[PDB]
Amino acid sequence: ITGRPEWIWLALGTALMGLGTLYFLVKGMGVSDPDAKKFYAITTLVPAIAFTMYLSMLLGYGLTMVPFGGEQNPIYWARYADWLFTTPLLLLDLALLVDADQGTILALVGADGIMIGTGLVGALTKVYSYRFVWWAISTAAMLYILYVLFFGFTSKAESMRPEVASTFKVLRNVTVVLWSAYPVVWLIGSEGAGIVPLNIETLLFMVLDVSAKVGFGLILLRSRAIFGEAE
Amino acid sequence: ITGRPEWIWLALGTALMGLGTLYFLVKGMGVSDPDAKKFYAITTLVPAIAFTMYLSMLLGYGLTMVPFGGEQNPIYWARYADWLFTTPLLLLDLALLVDADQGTILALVGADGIMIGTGLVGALTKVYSYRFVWWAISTAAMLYILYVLFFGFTSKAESMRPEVASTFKVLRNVTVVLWSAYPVVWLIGSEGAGIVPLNIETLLFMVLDVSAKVGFGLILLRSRAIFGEAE
Amino acid sequence: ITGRPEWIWLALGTALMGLGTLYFLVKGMGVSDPDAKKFYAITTLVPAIAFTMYLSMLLGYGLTMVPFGGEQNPIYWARYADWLFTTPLLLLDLALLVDADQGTILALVGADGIMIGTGLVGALTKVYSYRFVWWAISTAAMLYILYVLFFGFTSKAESMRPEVASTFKVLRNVTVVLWSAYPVVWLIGSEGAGIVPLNIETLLFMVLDVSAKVGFGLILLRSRAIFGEAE
Numbered sequence: 001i002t003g004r005p006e007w008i009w010l011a012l013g014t015a016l017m018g019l020g021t022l023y024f025l026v027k028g029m030g031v032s033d034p035d036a037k038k039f040y041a042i043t044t045l046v047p048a049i050a051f052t053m054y055l056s057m058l059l060g061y062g063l064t065m066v067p068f069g070g071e072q073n074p075i076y077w078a079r080y081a082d083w084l085f086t087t088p089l090l091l092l093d094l095a096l097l098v099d100a101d102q103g104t105i106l107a108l109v110g111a112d113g114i115m116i117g118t119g120l121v122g123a124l125t126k127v128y129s130y131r132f133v134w135w136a137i138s139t140a141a142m143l144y145i146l147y148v149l150f151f152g153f154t155s156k157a158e159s160m161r162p163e164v165a166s167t168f169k170v171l172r173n174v175t176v177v178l179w180s181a182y183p184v185v186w187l188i189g190s191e192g193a194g195i196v197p198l199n200i201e202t203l204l205f206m207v208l209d210v211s212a213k214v215g216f217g218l219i220l221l222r223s224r225a226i227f228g229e230a231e
Numbered sequence: 232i233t234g235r236p237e238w239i240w241l242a243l244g245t246a247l248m249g250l251g252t253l254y255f256l257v258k259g260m261g262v263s264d265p266d267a268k269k270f271y272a273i274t275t276l277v278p279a280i281a282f283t284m285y286l287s288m289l290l291g292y293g294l295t296m297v298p299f300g301g302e303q304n305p306i307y308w309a310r311y312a313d314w315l316f317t318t319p320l321l322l323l324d325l326a327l328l329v330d331a332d333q334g335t336i337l338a339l340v341g342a343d344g345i346m347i348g349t350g351l352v353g354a355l356t357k358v359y360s361y362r363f364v365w366w367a368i369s370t371a372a373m374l375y376i377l378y379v380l381f382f383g384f385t386s387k388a389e390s391m392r393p394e395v396a397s398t399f400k401v402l403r404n405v406t407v408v409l410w411s412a413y414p415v416v417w418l419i420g421s422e423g424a425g426i427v428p429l430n431i432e433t434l435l436f437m438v439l440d441v442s443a444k445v446g447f448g449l450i451l452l453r454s455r456a457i458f459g460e461a462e
Numbered sequence: 463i464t465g466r467p468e469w470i471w472l473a474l475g476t477a478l479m480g481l482g483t484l485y486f487l488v489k490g491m492g493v494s495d496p497d498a499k500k501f502y503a504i505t506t507l508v509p510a511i512a513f514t515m516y517l518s519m520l521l522g523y524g525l526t527m528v529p530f531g532g533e534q535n536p537i538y539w540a541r542y543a544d545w546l547f548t549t550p551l552l553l554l555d556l557a558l559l560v561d562a563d564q565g566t567i568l569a570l571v572g573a574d575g576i577m578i579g580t581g582l583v584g585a586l587t588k589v590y591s592y593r594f595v596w597w598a599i600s601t602a603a604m605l606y607i608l609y610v611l612f613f614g615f616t617s618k619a620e621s622m623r624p625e626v627a628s629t630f631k632v633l634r635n636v637t638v639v640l641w642s643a644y645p646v647v648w649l650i651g652s653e654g655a656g657i658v659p660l661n662i663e664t665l666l667f668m669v670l671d672v673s674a675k676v677g678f679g680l681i682l683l684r685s686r687a688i689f690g691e692a693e
């Protein structure tokens with residue numbers, strides 16, 4: 001484990017995702033509202049999945065070597081197995097908050113799968129220049145997601161209860177800022193141009209992951225928007 | 232790229248799926264009917280997924296070598312990753328058109344997963360004679376799907392609006408004819424008996440894919456069956 | 463095939479899953495109740511999936527070698543591909559029986575995916591002591607599932623029709639007893655401590671699989687709880 005300088009950030013990430021999972025699990029014990037139960041189930045699964053994948057990276061299972069640039073490059077593939085399941089769950093939290101229609105939910109989840117799937121292909125591609133073709137396709141899929149979150153959901157939240165509109169607006173802004181950083185870290189990190197070393201890259205993804213999952217969840221599960229209007 | 236004679240058909244397929252995706256995306260911009268939005272989302276995702284997998288084959292990522300018959304045989308595995316997601320989406324288009332019940336939808340999607348999954352196992356199997364055992368199981372799963380589309384959905388469409396009944400009947404006939412060709416191309420192509428060479432096999436799958444996805448989508452999204460009855 | 467002593471139990475399992483699939487398929491022909499159709503579709507898919515994965519193990523495709531303990535250990539990875547899809551389908555049978563809320567269904571299916579996913583990682587892990595870390599995480603996920611089936615569903619079934627309450631109680635008890643045996647067989651078998659040899663381990667999993675899928679299905683599909691109350 002300790003033979004890799006980035007191990008400290010993988011261990012911290014593992015701990016923070018595990019602690020986040022347990023807090024949400026305990027906090028959700030005393031909840032019977034069927035609407036609130038939906039948000040607790042979605043939001044608790046997110047850091048639980050991330051916990052297992054951070055642990056796999058810490059123990060060395062989620063790491064492979066990819067030859068490109070005449071070098072064997074360490075690629076943590078477990079990140080994409082994490083994101084494949086956690087990013088659509090996070091979008092479902094937002095879509096259920098605004099009572100989005102089914103067709104829009106399917107478009108979001110499908111574009112998200114394309115985003116993560118093409119990012120994985122780009123991470124494992126051995127022809128250096130082709131890695132950035134996949135990065136560009138994946139980034140186009142992300143821009144579609146961000147467009148929908150702004151010019152489809154925002155207008156839908158305003159016609160909703162005030163507390164669900166204000167909570168959505170906050171979580172929307174958090175998501176757009178944090179998610180946009182991921183393609184940048186990829187491009188300048190060891191998967192892309194190799195400007196930033198792997199140990200610093202790992203620290204950046206850990207800050208982003210914890211903020212986008214545990215920070216996101218703390219804002220959502222403390223809001224009254226997750227409960228139905230009741231007397 | 233150009234070192235493979237089949238590259239021209241992979242490049243054409245990539246272009247036609249990309250163009251198809253963009254047309255459906257633009258055409259769906261001016262749509263607010265929640266029913267129509269469902270069909271546009273399903274139908275636009277189909278060629279978008281196929282685009283990415285054709286590109287992976289063009290660039291050489293979606294290709295592996297499988298030893299059988301005393302030879303290293305080029306097997307494009309990316310086809311099955313495509314079909315795993317696009318064939319159930321196409322069946323969902325048909326099932327939603329006739330307002331099929333949930334139990335029937337699950338049976339269709341499950342049989343479809345078995346069809347594609349066993350076809351993938353057959354494509355990667357190293358014992359030559361066993362490849363055709365998997366082909367037979369996969370073909371049995373397809374025949375179940377075709378039976379349901381005829382002796383379960385057809386009777387359901389007649390009790391529906393006339394425009395949804397006539398549109399379903401057309402898309403049903405297109406699907407049964409085109410899908411039935413796939414097991415035949417597999418059997419006589421490089422995955423099976425090896426009668427037809429890979430470059431011709433690739434041309435045939437490209438014609439079938441574009442017809443079953445973009446041609447299918449053009450018929451559906453030009454129909455009024457996708458809109459609810461409104462004044 | 464016959465070069466492996468466990469082949470006899472893989473062949474028996476294949477036959478019993480295939481026969482089970484055909485019986486459920488025939489029995490479900492004469493069913494039009496939309497509620498009953500749901501249970502028949504879920505319950506017939508379970509042994510059909512298991513059939514294909516037992517066949518892959520029989521023919522040698524679903525087997526790999528994992529080095530640990532200074533030895534190349536035969537690991538049947540196809541079991542986890544089976545369980546990944548069949549265990550959530552079995553939980554869906556139970557959840558639909560008691561009309562569970564959506565949030566609870568998602569929590570069950572998500573915990574089940576974590577259970578199977580971490581068990582697969584543990585089966586393929588090359589550092590011997592780490593294999594049991596994954597076993598423990600997977601077992602914690604199972605205990606969560608069992609808790610929900612007892613202290614969330616049981617109370618919900620009592621407020622239901624008497625026949626659905628008594629049928630659920632029976633299937634609940636069958637599930638908790640049979641599922642609990644799996645982590646024990648893993649721990650003492652070739653994936654874990656290696657006390658029980660592989661051929662005996664394979665026999666035990668076959669008895670458990672057939673009971674948990676075909677036996678489970680025979681109890682459910684003979685009950686009147688799967689039909690709506692009708693005159």
Ligand SMILES: CC(C)CCC[C@@H](C)CCC[C@@H](C)CCC[C@@H](C)CCOC[C@@H](CO)OCC[C@H](C)CCC[C@H](C)CCC[C@H](C)CCCC(C)C
Nearest residue numbers: 109110113114117118120121124280283295308311312316
């Ligand atoms: C509606 C939305 C959900 C739609 C989703 C969008 C999606 C279509 C976007 C594209 C996804 C696609 C790129 C997934 C590729 C997975 C692949 C990286 C797995 C590893 O295989 C890659 C190479 C080794 O580098 O295999 C070496 C050769 C091996 C012999 C490969 C044989 C196994 C194949 C991988 C079998 C295909 C399985 C499916 C891809 C499983 C789904 C994986 C997940 C990442 C989507």
Ligand SMILES: CC(C)CCC[C@@H](C)CCC[C@@H](C)CCC[C@@H](C)CCOC[C@@H](CO)OCC[C@H](C)CCC[C@H](C)CCC[C@H](C)CCCC(C)C
Nearest residue numbers: 340341344345348349351352355511514526539542543547
């Ligand atoms: C309700 C419906 C959706 C049900 C679906 C029906 C489905 C059950 C039908 C059978 C599907 C099954 C054959 C999928 C097999 C995937 C497999 C080809 C992936 C590549 O692995 C094959 C060998 C190399 O040749 O791995 C070499 C050895 C490696 C060490 C393998 C270890 C990884 C395992 C593959 C882990 C299992 C992952 C799941 C199979 C992922 C789903 C893939 C998709 C193709 C279903």
Ligand SMILES: CC(C)CCC[C@@H](C)CCC[C@@H](C)CCC[C@@H](C)CCOC[C@@H](CO)OCC[C@H](C)CCC[C@H](C)CCC[C@H](C)CCCC(C)C
Nearest residue numbers: 049052064077080081085571572575576579580582583586
């Ligand atoms: C809501 C719920 C459904 C959530 C589900 C819970 C889930 C997150 C729990 C953890 C699942 C995770 C451990 C799955 C790992 C699959 C992995 C074993 C496949 C084989 O790859 C392992 C190594 C060889 O030993 O690959 C060698 C290196 C290769 C180069 C690997 C590159 C391919 C990657 C495997 C791509 C990721 C694909 C996804 C993991 C596909 C889903 C598989 C299924 C088992 C979940």
Ligand SMILES: *C/C=C(C)/C=C/C=C(C)/C=C/C1=C(C)CCCC1(C)C
Nearest residue numbers: 119138139142179182183186209212
């Ligand atoms: C909890 C994890 C989250 C919210 C991860 C989000 C990840 C992304 C938005 C990743 C995007 C990428 C691109 C847009 C292209 C480059 C490759 C990716 C996958 C890093």
Ligand SMILES: *C/C=C(C)/C=C/C=C(C)/C=C/C1=C(C)CCCC1(C)C
Nearest residue numbers: 350369370373410413414417440443
């Ligand atoms: C857009 C792609 C489509 C509609 C693909 C359809 C593919 C099939 C219907 C494939 C069927 C197969 C068999 C029936 C057995 C032989 C292997 C397959 C997977 C080619």
Ligand SMILES: *C/C=C(C)/C=C/C=C(C)/C=C/C1=C(C)CCCC1(C)C
Nearest residue numbers: 581600601604641644645648671674
């Ligand atoms: C039809 C198959 C069924 C119902 C299989 C159930 C399997 C389990 C409940 C497996 C549980 C495991 C653990 C709890 C940890 C050890 C590894 C597993 C996956 C065997």
Ligand SMILES: CCCCCCCCCCCCCCC
Nearest residue numbers: 181182184185195196197200204
């Ligand atoms: C979206 C965030 C990207 C900003 C990356 C900042 C990295 C600064 C760290 C110093 C770079 C290390 C280079 C010298 C080793």
Ligand SMILES: CCCCCCCCCCCCCCC
Nearest residue numbers: 016019020023210211214215218
């Ligand atoms: C009462 C609110 C705080 C509860 C404690 C939460 C502990 C989980 C770890 C959170 C750290 C990361 C927060 C986002 C920066």
Ligand SMILES: CCCCCCCCCCCCCCC
Nearest residue numbers: 412413415416426427428431435
């Ligand atoms: C379902 C369509 C299958 C028909 C295949 C027709 C192939 C004819 C092309 C000529 C065969 C090439 C053999 C000589 C190289």
Ligand SMILES: CCCCCCCCCCCCCCC
Nearest residue numbers: 247250251254441442445446449
């Ligand atoms: C107005 C209808 C035609 C629009 C142009 C569609 C261009 C997408 C490519 C379609 C070619 C394949 C059609 C099926 C044979």
Ligand SMILES: CCCCCCCCCCCCCCC
Nearest residue numbers: 643644646647657658659662666
């Ligand atoms: C949950 C069931 C686990 C019980 C396992 C009993 C196995 C007894 C078979 C004899 C053990 C073989 C050891 C000598 C070869």
Ligand SMILES: CCCCCCCCCCCCCCC
Nearest residue numbers: 478481482485672673676677680
């Ligand atoms: C009339 C009920 C029996 C029908 C025959 C079922 C045959 C399928 C194989 C069942 C054997 C396994 C039963 C569970 C132990």
Ligand SMILES: CCCCCCCCCCCCCC
Nearest residue numbers: 084085088089092105109113
């Ligand atoms: C490729 C993996 C995608 C599945 C991720 C799991 C979450 C799916 C959310 C589905 C939302 C409901 C759509 C109607």
Ligand SMILES: CCCCCCCCCCCCCC
Nearest residue numbers: 315316319320323336340344
């Ligand atoms: C194995 C991958 C299957 C999933 C394909 C994605 C489409 C799923 C459609 C689900 C239809 C809704 C069923 C109720």
Ligand SMILES: CCCCCCCCCCCCC
Nearest residue numbers: 139143146147150180183184
């Ligand atoms: C185009 C939709 C408007 C909202 C999206 C904001 C774009 C942020 C740019 C992200 C940069 C990634 C490289």
Ligand SMILES: CCCCCCCCCCCCC
Nearest residue numbers: 370374377378381411414415
């Ligand atoms: C048996 C259901 C009737 C409709 C299915 C038509 C069968 C077409 C044969 C396809 C040939 C594939 C080898």
